Amino acid sequence: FLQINGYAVSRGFKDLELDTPSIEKRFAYSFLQQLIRYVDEAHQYILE
Amino acid sequence: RDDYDFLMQTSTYYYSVRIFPGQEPANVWVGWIT
Amino acid sequence: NPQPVDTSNITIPEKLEYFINKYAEHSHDKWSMDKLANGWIYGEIYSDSSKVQPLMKPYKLLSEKEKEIYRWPIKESLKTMLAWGWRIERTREGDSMALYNGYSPRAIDMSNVTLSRDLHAMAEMMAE
Amino acid sequence: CSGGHASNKEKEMVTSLFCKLGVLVRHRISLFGNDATSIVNCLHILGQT
Amino acid sequence: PGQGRNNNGLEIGCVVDAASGLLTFIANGKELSTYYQVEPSTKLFPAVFAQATSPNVFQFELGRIKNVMPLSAGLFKSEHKNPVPQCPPRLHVQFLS
């Protein structure tokens, strides 16, 4: 009926912007980054 | 009531198209083609 | 836990109120033909056991209470819809329709008309 | 050919991970409790990648 | 009028004057402004172009209106004087492919 009377209801909030050009949000990016954090932490761990 | 003699002498022909409710009629075109 | 989204804070608008009035007209209409199909007898006295009732009168004629008992659930319905933040826009052709404002009282083939997928998801979340 | 290759920074950071893992494994096979072979295979597949 | 398809199914009625080549259309009982004039000896095929937005798309009705003889009379030579509408098996829907 909303469609019948032509009222369009939309999402509660439209997305403001997606930082797709910035590669920091790549799944490989964050995963490999945490991989490096743990590698460095374990490296100084084994240095101790 | 239409005149039977008029129906006999006339040449105008008719058909119709019922767009079922809910079918967006802007997406529906009716007419003749060659 | 059975809790909905509370929405008591928002107020209903009037351009939405015209749509609410039309949909309450539709609600009354389908209720009336439900009574016709069931076979409720037309009579001033209202007796469920005798199946008699006088409420087959048109929506504009219809009792304001009955109009109100349609409008109320409609009011909290659009109220929760706005609580979800969903913005509602009246099209210009729809506005022209309100401006313009045998005779068979016919319902609308809800099943035949179709809905978009995002609105389907909205229908599912409001249903839950 | 479908698409979705690693970025230049992805490649940089993978290579840095390789270097630091090699530093980690350098002279620590005895420190690793027979898992040194697991790290050896890890650095291996890292080399082929 | 607007929302004619809403309350009831919309009815577009096509009338062709084979003696003069005038093609006119009536929607909801009133004749629409758009009209066509065709040259003599033209063969016109009834046609509907539709993008389906519903399980049920449309319906060809081979009925007749006041002072207009139905489509089967024009199509078939045997029924050139038969006011009764007909849908013989020869008539069938064909889709572009």
Swiss-Prot record, chain C:
Disulfide bonds: none annotated. Channel activity is modulated by phosphorylation. Phosphorylation is increased in failing heart, leading to calcium leaks and increased cytoplasmic Ca(2+) levels. Induction: By TGFB1. Detected in heart muscle (at protein level). Heart muscle, brain (cerebellum and hippocampus) and placenta. The modification Phosphoserine is found at residue 96. Sequence repeats lie at residues 1-101. It comes from the Eukaryota. It is found in: Sarcoplasmic reticulum membrane. Cytosolic calcium-activated calcium channel that mediates the release of Ca(2+) from the sarcoplasmic reticulum into the cytosol and thereby plays a key role in triggering cardiac muscle contraction. Aberrant channel activation can lead to cardiac arrhythmia. In cardiac myocytes, calcium release is triggered by increased Ca(2+) cytosolic levels due to activation of the L-type calcium channel CACNA1C. The calcium channel activity is modulated by formation of heterotetramers with RYR3. Required for cellular calcium ion homeostasis. Required for embryonic heart development. The calcium release channel activity resides in the C-terminal region while the remaining part of the protein resides in the cytoplasm. Belongs to the ryanodine receptor (TC 1.A.3.1) family. RYR2 subfamily. Homotetramer. Can also form heterotetramers with RYR1 and RYR3. Interacts with FKBP1A and FKBP1B; these interactions may stabilize the channel in its closed state and prevent Ca(2+) leaks. Interacts with CALM and S100A1; these interactions regulate channel activity. Identified in a complex composed of RYR2, FKBP1B, PKA catalytic subunit, PRKAR2A, AKAP6, and the protein phosphatases PP2A and PP1. Interacts directly with FKBP1B, PKA, PP1 and PP2A. Interacts with SELENON. In cardiac muscles, identified in a complex, composed of FSD2, CMYA5 and RYR2. It is linked to Ventricular tachycardia, catecholaminergic polymorphic, 1, with or without atrial dysfunction and/or dilated cardiomyopathy: An arrhythmogenic disorder characterized by stress-induced, bidirectional ventricular tachycardia that may degenerate into cardiac arrest and cause sudden death. Patients present with recurrent syncope, seizures, or sudden death after physical activity or emotional stress. CPVT1 inheritance is autosomal dominant. Ventricular arrhythmias due to cardiac ryanodine receptor calcium release deficiency syndrome: An autosomal dominant arrhythmogenic disorder characterized by syncope, cardiac arrest and/or sudden unexpected death, often in association with physical exertion or acute emotional stress. Patients who survive manifest polymorphic ventricular tachycardia and ventricular fibrillation. Unlike typical catecholaminergic ventricular tachycardia, arrhythmias are not reproducible on exercise stress testing or adrenaline challenge. This is Ryanodine receptor 2. It comes from Homo sapiens (Human).
